[PDB]
Design a protein around this ligand. Structure first.
Ligand SMILES: [Cl-]
Length: 162
């Protein structure tokens, strides 16, 4: 199991533009196009991201490309965030995947904000962190996914995903 498989599970795959849990225009593997309410804008954005006139639809391959670029970026934002870096650096491999998941789903910034639980992860306070992480808008809006991640942070294993 690894990052890609993980996220692929959490985010699914759609070849046609859709609205996410928050109602935003998204595509492929959790690839967010826009916060705006215009399907057109979303279309523009897509074309631009794909490099062509898509008409709201893309190929699997394209979807995948987006995905790598996205995983890549997530990591990098992590590597560039003065708050994230240290944490990540101190984590074992499995757990990093978890931090990356969150970052992918909510943004560096978003994540950069879980100060306390980040602190907890740093000191390796698994159980406390999990509780902490649970008290969030994030958990409350996407309970099942949040659970997987949290479990993940908690045990250092892929069971949540098995
Ligand atoms: Cl969920």
């Amino acid at each position: 199991m690894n990052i890609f498989e993980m996220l692929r599970i959490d985010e699914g795959l759609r070849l046609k533009i859709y609205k996410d849990t928050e109602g935003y225009y998204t595509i492929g593997i959790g690839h967010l196009l826009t916060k705006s309410p215009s399907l057109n804008a979303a279309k523009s954005e897509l074309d631009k991201a794909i490099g062509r006139n898509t008409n709201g639809v893309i190929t699997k391959d394209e979807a995948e490309k987006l995905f790598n670029q996205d995983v890549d970026a997530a990591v990098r934002g992590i590597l560039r965030n003065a708050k994230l870096k240290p944490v990540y650096d101190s984590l074992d491999a499995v757990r990093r995947a978890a931090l990356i998941n969150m970052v992918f789903q909510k943004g560096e910034t978003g994540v950069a904000g879980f100060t306390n639980s980040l602190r907890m992860l740093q000191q390796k306070r698994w159980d406390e962190a999990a509780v902490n992480l649970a008290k969030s808008r994030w958990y409350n809006q996407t309970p099942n996914r949040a659970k997987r991640v949290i479990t993940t942070f908690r045990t250092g294993t892929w069971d949540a995903y098995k």
